[PDB]
Amino acid sequence: DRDSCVDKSRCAKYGYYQECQDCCKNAGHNGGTCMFFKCKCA
C-alpha cells in the first residue's frame, strides 16, 4: 500500500517533501519528488 506516500502524500503543484522522501527510502523506491499535486517516487 503506502497510500500515505504515493497519492495521499501531502505535496504541491511541483516541489519536494521530506515525508514522502524518507518513506520512499524505506519502501526501497529511492526517494520522492512532488508533481502535479502529489508526491511520487521511483
Q: What DSSP string describes 1-42? A: --GGGTTS----SEE--HHHHHHHHHHTS--EEEESSSEEE-
Number of domains in the chain: 1
Taking alpha carbons only, the member of 13, 38, 16, 12 closest to residue 2 is 38
Which triple of cell numbers denotes residue 29? 523506491
35 pairs with which residues across the strands? 14
**Cα 15 to the center of its chain, rounded Å:** 10
Range of the domain at 32: 1-42
Residues written for the chain: 42
**CATH number for the domain harbouring residue 20:** 3.30.30.10
Contact 27, 5 (CB under 8 A): yes
Q: Which amino acid is located at 9 in the chain?
A: S
**Cα 28 to the center of its chain, rounded Å:** 12
What residues contact residue 34 under an 8 Å CB cut-off, 6+ apart? Answer: 11, 12, 13, 14, 15, 16, 17, 20, 40
